[PDB]
Ligand binder design. Structure first.
Ligand SMILES: [Ca+2]
Length: 247
């Protein structure tokens, strides 16, 4: 996250770190005792399932914590419509190898209804342990960063992404995506934040409105963060989890 601030421990207790071969590569969001949501782009087919971990309950990634917990995965389920970089369907359900126990620091985020609308301009928060500027990693001990971002409709966002765009890039905010952020530079999610949550306030609670999707930009003007709408997959998530792990 560039242009944000440190969260405080426990503030975003659904935020998870996903690592591949021991290196943090993406965020994710805890949604039940055994399931996490992240982005499909974080799970390329050539990667090996057994090489992923998910760290829950963390604030400073590099610090010892008795509250953090690490898990492997027993299933990785990208939405089947996700085809290539920038595609719709950029969401993945991850089933932990074993269920975890919720705590002060590890709690699921509520998922929105299929037809939940989060209005343009709502101030949501994106969080992660990604880069704090282009090609600049978050410095150890890596406290979780957060950035408050107003929701930007996909229509406005597509017109911003057209400005000074590379002709050969599609930069397309799909029908299952929304944006959030600023037209000015300097405030954005960056490499390593993708897959993580856009948490929005509703009636005193927090919902997972979005999952950070595609992008190279880290703070460029006219490149607000692009997110997959969890609402676009509410039915698929409920169907999959109910069939695979009924409560
Ligand atoms: Ca970005």
């Amino acid at each position: 996250i560039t242009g944000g601030s440190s969260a405080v421990a426990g503030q975003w207790p659904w935020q998870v770190s996903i690592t591949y071969e021991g290196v943090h590569v993406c965020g994710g969001s805890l949604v039940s005792e055994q399931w996490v949501l992240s982005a499909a782009h974080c799970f390329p087919s050539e990667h090996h399932k057994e090489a992923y971990e998910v760290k829950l309950g963390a604030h400073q990634l590099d610090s010892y914590s008795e509250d953090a917990k690490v898990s492997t995965l027993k299933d990785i389920i990208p939405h089947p419509s996700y085809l290539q970089e920038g595609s719709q369907g950029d969401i993945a359900l991850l089933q932990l190898s074993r269920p975890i126990t919720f705590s002060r620091y590890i709690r699921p985020i509520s998922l929105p209804a299929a037809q939940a609308s989060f209005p343009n301009g709502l101030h949501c928060t994106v969080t992660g342990w990604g880069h704090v500027a282009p090609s600049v990693s978050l410095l150890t001990p890596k406290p979780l960063q957060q950035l408050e971002v107003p929701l930007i409709s996909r229509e406005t966002c597509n017109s911003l992404y057209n400005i000074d765009a590379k002709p050969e890039e599609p930069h397309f905010v799909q029908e299952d995506m929304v944006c959030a952020g600023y037209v000015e530079g300097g405030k954005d999610a960056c490499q390593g934040d993708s897959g993580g949550p856009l948490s929005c306030p509703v009636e005193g609670l927090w919902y997972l409105t979005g999952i950070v999707s595609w992008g190279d930009a880290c703070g460029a003007r006219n490149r607000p963060g692009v997110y997959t709408l969890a609402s676009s997959y509410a039915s698929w998530i409920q169907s999959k989890v109910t069939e695979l792990q009924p409560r």
